[PDB]
Structures are given as structure tokens and as C-alpha cells.
Design a protein around this ligand. Structure first.
Ligand code: ATP
Ligand code: ADP
Ligand code: ADP
Ligand code: ADP
Ligand code: ZN
Ligand code: ZN
Lengths: 183, 716, 561
């Protein structure tokens, strides 16, 4: 579509996308240059800098920051491409119709539509960062259920998403109420 | 019919077009009708039709903004068609131009757009421009987005979103893509080849279905760096209107391991998914270099992925792949077979007309002074590619700035507009820039065109007729050869004393049949022998094939023909198709030293002697070298020609050069003492006093003996 | 015996279309032509193991599995493999070389593992490892760890596959020696098939197959195109047809308005390919198969050459009888001679004699010109002598014509050639014919028994031979009625064949010059005696007397000895 896709999504995504999240840094004692002009240590720290996260005891990188990293890694402006979508959800299902000359999978397969070996690896970006319970009663009642009956429970938790200042471009899901399905 | 003439509209409305009554009747149009108008570069717009009898029949009037949007000039032809299925714009998002809005306070929307769209019903399409004149100010805007897409009518209820950051104007100009064919000159042949090879498969696919063939897919352009390959690809892509998907080489090769393959796969997948499309793989040699180069696995996986993608696209998809490389041998050989980049195109340095066209194209924004002689610059610039000409213009402008720097205060950050007006490049500036130019195209063999007729070669009529019957007849009358079943001769070998003008004969032969000329001097052959050159004989003959009908020329072949290089040359000569109009012309001074294998039939068999110029020939040469020099009125060179018996053309050039040197010395001495616009006969006598033959009697006798031996070898 | 399986669609107007009588795969045997012998071999080695596996049980043998096709690129190896696979109608697993090689590290081997496992699961199966060289190049080419892991995995899977399972492996590679040598042992790709460039009949078949949909004009003479096209592989012929169609549309472009998206239906329906378009395409095209050694057939009989009757009889006795009647040779227990060496003045027609010998035994002809020998000597030639003889063995019976031995035999190359010739199988029909103008310069080692020991002198053409050659060269040229040539033949005593060719070529050049002059003036449909006389006025011998005396002295020495 000659550029980024056009669709409307949650407000949190929009507001996060508007920000850039750069973490400013001041003149390091190792710099060799006048006041103006930043060399290599005084430059702003990108929001996806793994060193900062692992130094602050954060195990994952606040997905939107990962999106910023991917966009920066490629997609030069004004030239070099006509836009390639940076995010793609992996799919492992065998293509039912490839037909370089072979028939469908049940009785024929080529090397172009063969699911390649899958390399499992721990993900590095977590979509939602902080799950927040508005009040202690919301879960206290749920646990009181087990207390009274002794059996386990299970229930969906409705709520809404919002920013999370404590993490670079982080999101928090605030849960408002819990509904218990018939189980 | 609908090819209405463009004219300047009286009204300032951005969506109003006035048409003649007669044309309105012809096209059945009416006042207030919204019509789709197409001009140039596939640009389209929506204009409200208004009857206007003032214009001549077959003419229409549009304002400045509409013409700028359509990328057309006054006096052109535009096609107008009905647009009855245009819906009202549900929501239009528009942003202004920053520079225009500078110095404006308050809500711009209410000031300008609110009266502009209310009770107006102005059609708007994405990529258009509209200018609002409010109070004492005039501000331009852009049709950033329209809903429904891509265009719609802005009704009274239509919602307008003016919120957004200002748009810099520099982007539109400095990013001047969509360059048409008018931005490329001096390479009409290759441009026509690429057009006939790309447009027809994409613009008119039904042709090949009617003929029932599979059109060629791959294309590979190559030539010296800086000859506008990328510019030609961009122009073709923009004119064709296809989904261009430029891919760079260094950009792809700079990604982490395991990412370049993903980028290539994604690019090809998107190109396929939006057929028709045109993929341009710039600097492909940086992705798939020759096998003997880097053997690293990361350097092999990319090549394998590219080959797999190239082989996998054979289908009913309209995908054309264009690649650019400095030389044909740099790319892996596997990329030059059927189903891949099997079609080749060669770009060569332009001729005088090409350089003139390039100069005019670049020198249209310069504030040039009156004393401009672009033809003179084109004549005096030989071997310059387009990039060199652009650099020349930049350096000339810089020289002009330096010269005018005296009236500039560097410390002050503001410069008087009067001084800026006085700026103007001059011929002296261009001459200085040429003096500072550093051409580099000629460092390697490159295809070029020559324009020598049968007038710069004096005498030698029998040789001229022999060459004509050997070369010209096959090219122009191959049907006769087919009728008589005779295979045309490939090449000839010129032998004789140095300075006879063999290169001139080769250039003339090339010119007569209108064939591109390739030169390979002795030093190039030696460099190939030592293996320290950037090109090889196989590459030379591949370029010759690509740029057919070509004429390959070898100079002082005896240096290498005293062997691996000779073996390669023989193999290539045997390989070439006979029907191909490729002629190998060798020049040497010691024919007996040539390897006998070169002289065998089916190779450089024909042996042609080039004698020294005769009296009339010497006179003609002297006159030719002095055509553009001021001579003494009443001066005759017949005596000088008579006195110069046994001298070669180089000797006559030396005599003329010494005479000119004496003339310039005398003129400079007179000027310093301060006259002599021409050269008097005394200068010629002084120059002749130092004449010295470049050929000894023994060598001439040896050449005559060899000629007599050759005649006897064919005399029974 | 021989091509016995070929004798007798795709397992499949509306009825005809349904029964097959962009992705139009399943190309059957119809879509291939000019390679009848190789197609028969492939079918025999593929179908019977799968279609009729009980015959081997009845007779009690283990059928061979590995099949290795190799030939110049573009000859249609992939087409043949796909056609055979579709005809057999068995589980077809396709693996490409670069496609596997483009995977990440550690994933180009698991794909092979799963491929072989699946092929075993759903037997009968056919596996076509296209471009096997890319995944198994020569041992010295690749030293990286992955480039050896892949090869080792391939070898292990191949060895483990040899079992009752009805699975057959087919691999394609242009260069027979490029494959890792370890892949050509028993229990692996043992059986080898060679694909050679087609002959005139093969070219005609290919042209007919490709030129069935094009709107060909009535003035098309596909026979003439087949005759003229020499050394054109199938891919080159397809490119030729495409270029001719492109030229036709380009010529018709005058009435085509490119600006309009659509075109008038009459113009679209008026496209027609003319013979001139094909000629122009031939002019533009450029084959590349001949750049490397290839296998091709020849059709020269004992009539395009003159004289040499004793030489013809000697060659017949040397080659024909062993091939036609090996039974009597076995009866007498004498093995046939291996090679022969022609020597004599240049231009006497040794190549034609070699081609005639090849034709008489109906054996494929392989050639090695002088430049090829020099390139191999300098070690910059892709092929190799071992490769040449491997192809010769695979394409037996074969005649290998080594031209201009003097260049290399003035040695590493000579040693390799001697070893290859000595290692040749005794009963296998692999004949070697050497050509040289300087017998003395040749290394004597080559002339020992069991090698090119049978020397044959080729004398200069005689009056009868000269007249025959002149008549043969001028047969296909429009000549004046009642144009005699005996006088010219007599006047050309001592002239070699090249000299007569030069004379006739100059005569034709004068004729075409006069015809062009006449056409410009406005006539010359023949080549009259005046042109021949004018050319003869400048023609002369090309062999010096001393050379002839030396050749005669050497022949006398040989006869006396
Ligand atoms: N009988 C034939 N012999 C040769 N080529 C043929 C024949 N019939 C058709 N062709 C055409 O010749 C070309 C052969 O393509 P193909 O991919 O089979 O060649 P290849 O060089 O064997 O392939 P590979 O890339 O697998 O090594 C195609 O254009 C095919 O249409
Ligand atoms: N007609 C022309 N021919 C050649 N060069 C041209 C022409 N017109 C402009 N140029 C200039 O010459 C250069 C061509 O760049 P080019 O060689 O295509 O880049 P690349 O290195 O990517 O191939 C540019 O600076 C371009 O502006
Ligand atoms: N008719 C002619 N005969 C000989 N030389 C000529 C003729 N016309 C011009 N020349 C001059 O002869 C020179 C040839 O230079 P060069 O290439 O060094 O020698 P050659 O051309 O004999 O190899 C050119 O510089 C050219 O100016
Ligand atoms: N009987 C013959 N004697 C001599 N030359 C012949 C004869 N028949 C054909 N020729 C010509 O000889 C040429 C090839 O000569 P040949 O001896 O085979 O190769 P070379 O000249 O390299 O030894 C061909 O062009 C052919 O027209
Ligand atoms: Zn710093
Ligand atoms: Zn598939």
C-alpha cells in the first residue's frame, strides 16, 4: 500500500507511538570536546537499549520500544524501498497450495513449502508490562471463594489498558472486576 | 477530440477549467461538470468544467496551481474525461506548507479554508495543491488524505482536519523523483531498448498472450560508474507507473547475519503480491560477486537465496528485475542463463550531442551569464560521463562564488540581495572548472561512438574501397550474403610503419556502418597479461556483443602477440557468432612477430598494408590540421608538402605544433613588450628547419620487402 | 533390448481439454524431443523399479538406485526429470541445491533428513536433487564446517536409503567432476547419464514443440532454421523463438498506440511471425554451449571427402569391424586397437575423416580443439581430461578427436592423457583420434603400443579429390548454367582444400559485389566464369615445398621402417 498500513487501534498504541522515549544523558567525564557537539557517550540513549533494562532489573523491553527498534533498523525515508512491514506473526502451518509442479501435501511436497526447522527461544519483548488490581477486595473475594468451598476457581478479569511511566514505553492493564463463568 | 490545449486561466480557483463551446459540444460536456483531466507523467486531477467561448476551438484554460500539479506547461495537450461517479468527501485531512504559513496567527482553517470550501463543492484528490488568498496573504496547501479515497468532493458537511505539523517545502523539490524521459539525454538508444523491453510486457501484456510467448524477464544493465544507470531505471519505472521496489546492494549487505535473506524474501514477496511491479536491484555485484571473491558462508547464502527467488518467479506474474553492475564479469556466472538476467544492456560515454544535452539539462537552474557557449564546452569535453559534467557545473558555480566573494562580509550572516543578483557563471569559470576536472571513465575500456568520414583520411582510395567491401556490404546487404551463401569476414589486420593513421581508418570504418567503437591499447593488454586490470578479454567481447554492431580495436598487438592472453583471444574470436556484426581490427608495426595462429583462416586473416601518405595526402593532412587556425592570407602549403617527402602524419603534426609554438612565443613576447593574429610563413620555415623523419630507410625497405613477399605468396 | 520401453495423457472440445488431448506442469514425454536414447535410459532405470517391482523378485537381483544426469546447462535435465516423475505418478519430493543452501546454519540438514524420512514413509517415491553440486561441490572448493556437515549428512542418508524401499534418487549437475568424488561409489550415484546437444532432427523437434502456439506466418521454413541452427541447445531455441516474436511485435508497433491501455482487436489479431524475424533472431542470439566440451552426433559419410581410398579402408578395418562384428574378434581372441593418429599437411580434411569414422559406427563425437588444450595446460579450463574421458565412457560408443597435439606435446597434460588412455576399458568402445601436423614434435611416449601407435598419413588432395571438393563446396551456391570446374581443378595442382574454399569464397565475394553494384545502378543471379578467373588470378598455394618434401621423407621413413 505504498507505505504503512491504515487502520485505527487502541488509544494507548497511538499515544505511545507519538512519543520517542529517548533517555537524555549529560556530559560524561570521559568526553573530549567543547560544550556543543556530542561524541559517543553524551548521545541520548535509545529506549530499546538492553544495557539500561538489565541494569535496572527489567527483564523485557516494553513491546512498543521493540517496534521502535525494528523501525529504526530499516525503512529509510524518501528512498531505499516502498515500505516493508517490520512485524510479521510467524506461521508454521504447511502451505496447502504451493504447486511448483507438485500436488498438495497429502500426496506430494517440495522444498519450497516445507516448514523449516523451528528454533524455540525465549522472547525478549513483553506486550503488556504491568497488571494492576484496583483494590484488594477484587481478589480477596475470589480467594474467599476457595476458602469457603476449598475447591479451585477460574474467572476472566475485565479492565482497560493505559501507559506505565515506570518503564520505557510500558503498558499496564488495570483490572476493574472479575466474572466467574460456570465451571 | 479530448486533446484540449492548455492555457492560463483568468480565475484563481484551483478546481475550475474553462473550455471552448465547440469542444464542449464535441465532448457533450456542460457547465459545472466535474471531469477527470490527465496531462503528463500519468498525473490526474478533477476540474469543474465551465463553458468559455473566448478560447479557440479545441482549447482549455487552467490556472497555475493545476498546471503545476499536472506537471505540464502551457500549450500542451490534456485529455478530459467524464467523472460522474465522484462521491462527497467524508473526511479530508490537509496540512499546509511551513514556509507559506510563516507569520500567521490564529486558526488557519477559519482564516483560509472555511470560506474556501463552504458553498464551493471543490473536488479534491490526494497529491493535489490548492492556494487560498486571504486578506493580504496567499497560502498553499496539500491534499494529504481524502475519504473516500483517492479523491472526493468537499461538501458543506464534509469534515476537514487541518491539525498536524507543518510540511517542509524542501522535500517536494530536493526529492524530485518521478523524473520523466526528458531528464535523460545522450542515451536514446539504451533508453529505447529498456522501454521496448519493459513497457510492452507491463503496459500491454495482452500482446504476448495474442502471440502466445513468454516475454523475457531478467534485464542486466552495465557500464562505467556515473553514467546514469540508476537515473534511467528510475525514469523508466516512474513513466511505466508500475510498483517500483528499489533495492540497494550495500543496504542489504549491511544487515546482521540471517537478515539479508529475510529482506530479499520479503521484497520479492511484496513485489509478487502487487503485480505489476518492477524490482531494481542496484549494485548487484555487491550482493553476488564473482566466485573467486569472498568464500564466506554469509557471502554464499545470500547468492543462493537470490538465485532461488529468481528461479521461483516464473509464473503469470508481471515482475521485471533490473540489475546494475560496473562490469559484466563481476556478477556470478550463474546469473547469466535462461530464466534469469539473460538480456544485457551496455551504457557508454556520450558523444558531443549527448554532452550538450546533459549540460542543458543540468544548466537550467543556474544563473548563467550571457557569454555561454554550451556547444564549445561540449566540444572541449571529451570522455566526460554525466556525473563529471554535473561536478563541472558545481565547480564552475563555486569558482563564480569565489570570484564574487570580495563583495561579501563573511562575519556578517546576512548578504545584500543586490550582490546575490550580480551572481552569474561565465565562460572563464567553466574553463577553470575544466582545468580542475578529473575524468576517470577512460581508465578502462568503454563503448564509444565516433564520427569520422572518408575525409580525414587522405588518399588510400584502394584501401578505402577494400574496407568498404569487407565491412559495409555485410552490414547493409546481408540478404545478398544469404542469397549467395557466403559467411561475412570477421576482422582484418592493419600493418605498416607507425603514424600512418590506422586508428583513423578504424574510426572511419566504424562510423560508416554506424557501429559503436571499442578501443584496447597496448598498456591495457599488458595490464591484462599481468592480471592487475579490472577487466578481461572475455569481458571486452561480452560488452562488444551487448553493444552490437560493434568494432573492437587492438593497438600494438605485437606486444602481447610476440601465450595465455593470445589463447583467450583466440578462444573468444572462435566463440562469437558469425552473424553478429562484430569486427576485430588489429594494428601492429611488426607483422612477422605476430603469432601465426592469429593469421589462420576464420580469424584475423586478411592483412592490409597501410603505406605512408603521398604528396596530395600530406597536403590534405596539413590543411585538415590547420582548418581551425588563423593562417597568413595568401599562404600556400604546397611547397611545404612537397619538401616533406617521406614524413609520416605524426611528423606533419609535429611540424605544425612547432610552428604554433613559435607563433605563441612571438605573440607573448610582443604582448609583454606592449598584433600577430595568425602565423606567417617564417614560422613555418623555422619549424621545418627542425624537421626529422620518424621512419628510417631500412625499416621502410623491410616493410616493402614484406609486402612484396605477401604479393608473391598470392601471385601465381 | 536398446530403446525397448519407448514403443507402445499424463494419467488424466471440453472433453479433449479435460483429457489433455501458467502452471501447466505434468509435461509428458510429448513435451521432450531429440533425446530419445537418454530418455529411454531414464525411463528404464526409473519406471521398472517402481511400476513393476516383482520382476526383480522373480529374477532375484537388487536394482540400482542412484542415477546421475549431467550435461551442458539448458539441455533440459529438469524438464526430463519432472516429466518422468509425473509420468510415473509416484510421491515426488523435490529438493533444490541453492534452496537448501540458503537456509540458516543447522537447518539445511534437518530439511534433508525430513525429506528422506518422508520419501521412505510414502513409498514408492522419487527424489530429484536438482543442482546437487551446490550442496556437494568438489572437496577442495569448500573447507567450511557446514559445507562438510551437509555433504556427510547427504552421504549418510544415501547409504541408509539402500534397502527394500522403492525409492529412487535422481541428481543433476552440469559438470560431472564437480560433484564430490565420494558420491560416485557403489550403493550411491553409480549409474550416469550424459545429455548432449541435439542434432538437426533434435533441433527440428524442439522447434516444433515450442513453435506450436505462435501465430506463425505461412512463409515459415522450420526445416531451414533447424539446418542453420548448429550448437543451439533447447534453451537457446526457446530464446530464439521469443526474440523472433519480440521482433515481430516491434515491427508491428508502428500501428500500435502505446499511450492507450488497450489496442484495436484487428491489430492484435494481425500479428504474424515472418521468416525474416527468425533470421534476425538468429543474428541476435548467441549460443554458449560450445564454449565447453560437449557430446554431439555427426552425419558425414564417405562422400563429402575425396580420395584417400586406402586410408578409408584402413580406418574401416580399424574401427568398423570391432564395432559391427565383435563376435569374430572374440573368436580369434584379439582385442581391437584403441587409438589412431593422423598426420600430414594442414587442410587435408582430418576432421571430416574423424566425423565419418564416428558416423559409420554411429558413435557420438567429442572434440578438443587446440585452444582447449592450451587452456587446460595453463590450468584455467573448467573441465579436465579426466572429465572428458568420463563423459566419453558415459556416452559410449564415442570418438574423442584430440586436435593439434603438437601444442601440448612439444608434461602434466601429456601424463594425464597417457594415464587416462591406459586406464581405458579394453572392450569398451572409446576410440581416440589424434591430429597433428608435426609428428616428430609429438612426445614419443604417446606412440607406444596400447596408445596412439597407428600412424596414418593424409596426403594432399589429388586432381580427382580436388574436383570432388570443389564440386562439394559449390553445390549449395547458385552457379551459371554449364559452368565447368575440371579446368580449375586441374589448374589447382598442389592446392589444399582450404585453398579451394578460399578461391570459391573470393569468387562469391566478387559476384556479390557485382550484384550490389547492379542493384544500386537500377541482374547477377549466378556466379559466372569471369568471377572465378578473377579470383584465381590472386589465389595461390598455402603449403611451402619444403614442408611437402619433409612430409614425403617422413612417410618414406615410416614405410621403410
Ligand atoms: N526437449 C527439450 N530439450 C531441451 N530443452 C527443452 C526441451 N523442450 C523444451 N525445452 C526448453 O528448454 C529449457 C530447459 O529448461 P530446464 O530448466 O529444464 O533446463 P536445465 O538447464 O536442465 O535446468 P536446471 O536449472 O534444473 O539445471 C526450457 O526453456 C524448456 O522449455
Ligand atoms: N543523462 C544522464 N546521463 C548520465 N548521468 C546523468 C544524466 N543526467 C544526469 N546525470 C547525473 O549523473 C549521475 C548518474 O548517477 P548514476 O551513475 O546513475 O548512479 P549509480 O552510481 O547509482 O549508478 C547523477 O549525478 C545524475 O544526476
Ligand atoms: N590521413 C592521415 N594519415 C596519417 N595520419 C593522419 C591522417 N589524418 C590525421 N592523421 C594524424 O595521425 C595521427 C595518428 O596517431 P597514432 O595513432 O599515434 O598513429 P597511427 O594512427 O598511425 O597508429 C593522429 O594524431 C592524426 O592527427
Ligand atoms: N577431401 C578434402 N580434402 C581437403 N579438405 C577438405 C576435404 N573435404 C572438405 N575439406 C575442407 O577442409 C576444411 C577443414 O580441414 P581439416 O583438415 O578438417 O581441418 P584442418 O585444416 O584444421 O586440418 C573444411 O572447411 C572443408 O571444407
Ligand atoms: Zn561527549
Ligand atoms: Zn511446494
Amino acid at each position: 500500500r505504498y507505505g504503512p498500513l491504515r487502520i485505527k487501534e487502541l488509544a494507548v498504541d497511538e499515544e505511545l507511538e507519538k512519543e520517542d522515549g529517548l533517555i537524555p544523558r549529560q556530559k560524561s567525564k570521559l568526553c573530549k570536546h567543547g560544550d556543543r557537539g556530542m561524541c559517543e557517550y553524551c548521545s541520548p540513549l535509545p529506549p530499546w537499549d538492553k544495557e539500561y533494562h538489565e541494569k535496572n532489573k527489567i527483564k523485557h523491553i516494553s513491546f512498543h520500544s521493540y517496534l521502535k527498534k525494528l523501525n529504526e533498523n530499516a525503512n529509510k525515508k524518501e528512498n531505499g524501498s516502498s515500505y516493508i512491514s517490520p512485524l510479521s506473526e510467524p506461521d508454521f502451518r504447511i502451505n496447502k497450495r504451493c504447486h511448483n509442479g507438485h500436488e498438495p501435501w497429502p500426496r506430494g511436497i517440495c522444498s519450497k513449502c516445507q516448514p523449516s526447522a523451528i528454533t524455540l527461544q525465549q522472547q525478549e519483548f513483553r506486550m503488556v508490562d504491568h497488571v494492576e488490581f484496583q483494590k484488594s477486595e477484587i481478589i480477596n473475594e475470589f480467594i474467599q471463594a476457595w476458602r469457603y468451598t476449598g475447591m479451585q476457581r477460574f474467572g476472566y478479569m475485565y479492565g482497560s489498558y493505559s501507559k506505565y511511566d515506570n518503564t520505557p514505553l510500558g503498558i499496564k492493564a488495570v483490572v476493574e472486576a472479575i466474572y466467574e463463568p460456570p465451571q | 477530440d479530448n486533446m484540449l490545449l492548455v492555457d492560463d486561466a483568468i480565475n484563481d480557483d484551483n478546481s475550475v477549467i474553462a473550455i471552448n463551446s465547440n469542444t464542449m459540444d464535441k465532448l457533450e460536456l456542460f457547465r459545472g461538470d466535474t471531469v477527470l483531466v490527465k496531462g503528463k507523467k500519468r498525473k490526474d486531477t478533477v476540474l469543474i468544467v465551465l463553458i468559455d467561448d473566448e478560447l479557440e476551438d479545441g482549447a482549455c484554460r487552467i490556472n497555475r496551481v493545476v498546471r503545476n500539479n499536472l506537471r505540464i506547461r502551457l500549450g500542451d495537450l490534456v485529455t478530459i474525461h467524464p467523472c460522474p461517479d465522484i462521491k462527497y468527501a467524508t473526511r479530508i485531512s490537509v496540512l499546509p506548507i511551513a514556509d507559506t504559513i510563516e507569520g500567521i496567527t490564529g486558526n488557519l482553517f477559519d482564516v483560509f479554508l472555511k470560506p474556501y470550501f463552504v458553498e464551493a463543492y471543490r473536488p479534491v484528490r490526494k497529491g493535489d495543491h490548492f492556494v487560498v488568498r486571504g486578506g493580504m496573504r496567499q497560502v498553499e496547501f496539500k491534499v494529504v488524505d481524502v475519504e473516500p479515497e483517492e479523491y472526493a468532493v468537499v461538501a458543506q458537511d464534509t469534515i476537514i482536519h487541518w491539525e498536524g505539523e507543518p510540511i517542509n517545502r524542501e522535500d517536494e523539490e530536493n526529492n524530485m523523483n518521478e523524473v520523466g524521459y526528458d531528464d535523460i539525454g545522450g542515451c536514446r538508444k539504451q533508453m529505447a531498448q529498456i522501454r521496448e523491453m519493459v513497457e510492452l510486457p507491463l503496459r500491454h501484456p495482452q500482446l504476448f498472450k495474442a502471440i502466445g510467448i513468454k516475454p523475457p524477464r531478467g534485464v542486466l544493465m552495465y557500464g562505467p560508474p556515473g553514467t546514469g544507470k540508476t537515473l534511467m531505471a528510475r525514469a523508466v519505472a516512474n513513466e511505466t507507473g508500475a510498483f517500483f521496489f528499489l533495492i540497494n546492494g550495500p543496504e542489504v549487505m549491511s544487515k546482521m547475519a540471517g537478515e539479508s535473506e529475510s529482506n530479499l524474501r520479503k521484497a520479492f514477496e511484496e513485489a509478487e503480491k502487487n503485480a505489476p511491479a518492477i524490482i531494481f536491484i542496484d549494485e548487484i555485484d555487491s550482493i553476488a560477486p564473482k566466485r573467486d571473491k569472498t568464500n564466506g558462508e554469509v557471502e554464499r547464502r545470500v547468492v543462493s537465496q537470490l538465485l532461488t527467488l529468481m528461479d521461483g518467479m516464473k509464473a503469470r506474474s508481471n515482475v521485471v528485475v533490473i540489475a546494475a553492475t560496473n562490469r559484466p564479469n563481476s556478477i556470478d556466472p550463474a546469473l547469466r542463463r535462461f530464466g534469469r538476467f539473460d538480456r544485457e544492456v551496455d551504457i557508454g560515454i556520450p558523444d558531443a550531442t549527448g554532452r550538450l544535452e546533459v549540460l542543458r539539462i543540468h544548466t537550467k537552474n543556474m544563473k548563467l551569464a550571457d557569454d555561454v557557449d554550451l556547444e564549445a564546452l561540449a566540444a572541449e569535453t571529451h570522455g566526460y560521463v554525466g556525473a563529471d559534467i554535473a561536478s563541472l557545473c558545481s565547480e564552475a558555480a563555486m569558482q563564480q562564488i569565489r570570484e564574487k566573494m570580495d563583495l561579501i562580509d563573511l562575519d556578517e550572516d546576512e548578504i545584500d540581495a543586490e550582490v546575490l543578483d550580480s551572481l552569474g557563471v561565465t565562460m572563464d569559470n567553466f574553463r577553470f572548472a575544466l582545468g580542475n576536472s578529473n575524468p576517470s571513465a577512460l581508465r578502462e575500456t568503454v563503448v564509444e561512438s565516433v564520427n569520422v568520414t572518408w575525409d580525414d583520411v587522405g588518399g588510400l582510395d584502394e584501401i578505402k574501397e577494400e574496407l568498404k567491401e569487407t565491412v559495409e556490404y555485410p552490414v547493409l546487404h546481408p540478404d545478398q550474403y544469404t542469397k549467395f551463401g557466403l559467411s561475412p569476414s570477421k576482422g582484418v589486420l592493419f600493418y605498416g610503419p607507425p603514424g600512418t593513421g590506422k586508428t583513423l581508418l578504424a574510426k572511419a570504418v566504424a562510423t560508416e556502418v554506424s557501429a559503436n567503437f571499442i578501443s584496447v591499447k597496448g598498456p591495457e593488454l599488458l595490464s591484462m597479461w599481468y592480471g592487475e586490470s579490472e577487466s578481461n578479454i572475455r569481458d571486452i567481447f561480452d560488452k562488444a556483443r551487448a553493444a552490437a554492431p560493434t568494432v573492437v580495436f587492438l593497438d600494438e598487438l605485437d606486444s602481447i602477440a610476440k601465450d595465455r592472453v593470445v589463447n583467450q583471444l583466440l578462444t573468444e574470436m572462435d566463440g562469437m557468432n558469425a552473424k553478429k556484426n562484430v569486427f576485430v581490427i588489429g594494428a601492429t608495426n611488426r607483422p612477422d612477430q605476430i603469432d601465426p595462429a592469429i593469421l589462420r583462416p576464420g580469424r584475423l586473416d586478411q592483412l592490409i598494408y597501410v603505406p605512408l601518405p603521398d604528396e596530395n595526402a600530406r597536403l590534405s593532412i596539413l590543411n585538415a590540421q590547420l582548418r581551425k587556425t588563423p593562417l597568413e592570407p595568401g599562404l600556400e602549403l604546397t611547397a611545404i608538402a612537397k619538401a616533406t617527402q617521406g614524413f609520416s602524419g605524426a611528423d606533419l603534426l609535429y611540424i605544425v605544433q612547432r610552428a604554433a609554438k613559435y607563433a605563441i612565443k612571438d605573440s607573448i613576447e610582443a604582448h609583454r613588450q606592449h598584433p600577430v593574429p595568425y602565423i606567417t610563413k617564417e614560422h613555418f620555415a623555422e619549424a621545418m628547419k627542425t624537421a626529422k623523419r620518424s621512419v628510417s630507410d631500412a625499416e621502410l625497405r623491410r616493410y616493402e620487402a614484406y609486402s612484396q613477399q605477401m604479393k608473391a605468396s598470392r601471385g601465381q
